[PDB]
Symmetry: C2
Subunit: 154 residues, 2 copies
Amino acid sequence: SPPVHPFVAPLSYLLGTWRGQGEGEYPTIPSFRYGEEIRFSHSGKPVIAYTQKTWKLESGAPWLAESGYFRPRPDGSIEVVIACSTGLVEVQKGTYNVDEQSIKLKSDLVGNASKVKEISREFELVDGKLSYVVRLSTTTNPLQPLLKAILDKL
Amino acid sequence: PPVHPFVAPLSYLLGTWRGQGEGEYPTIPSFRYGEEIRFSHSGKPVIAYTQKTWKLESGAPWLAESGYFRPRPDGSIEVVIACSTGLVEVQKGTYNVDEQSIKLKSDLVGNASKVKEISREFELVDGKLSYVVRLSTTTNPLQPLLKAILDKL
């Protein structure tokens, strides 16, 4: 109930809880589905808190989780910092587009994962639903899609 | 779910802690803050950590951080933290069941060009959670920055 800070207001469409499912595929793995829930919340500051958890679609058993903070600026730039339950950290930097309701991020740092070279994350509201693509590049492989999901707002 | 065996030795952390701290550093004039930390789990060998601080006078939200504690049965532990200020940390160290303590030093501080290292040491004293955070910057040696004491709710 504190007001959305003017710096966060252009991203106010994110605030709430989203739940849906994703798909992971990478040249290394065989392809898999997962349930996902993301919550974007705030406390009146110029940051949005992000928390996410995934689960195996059929058993319901908890899978992974991550959490962090989205820091939009009014020039349209944004940095996002994320810690993952696997022990990875990321600093993502990029831009947001108000007209298109999208966010395009590429990793400036991937921490504590030597096999990982870059991670990119793009969000886009499509038909009222929050969608994303995560791309990963490794010491083995080029930057390519890894995870895609579309989630409904609760 | 039940506590994972890797998590069991640190199960004393699980729940919500509330108290206050004080920060001081040769460049910063001394300041106090309120703080609340929540340690939780979902049966995996990982504890989720979320923290917030506020101004004592006004109750105004101040800073927040969140991440994960990953204890292993050799007594090692890795902690990954992302901060509302735009920092990330990978902290590595040990926990000691006897001394009820966790001692961590950063392997990595990300996105903060003048912060060089951060160490975080927790101890349960008399049932309260106490910690010390030490910081080194480009121009100041590693030394204490934050000290806090929290009561379990």
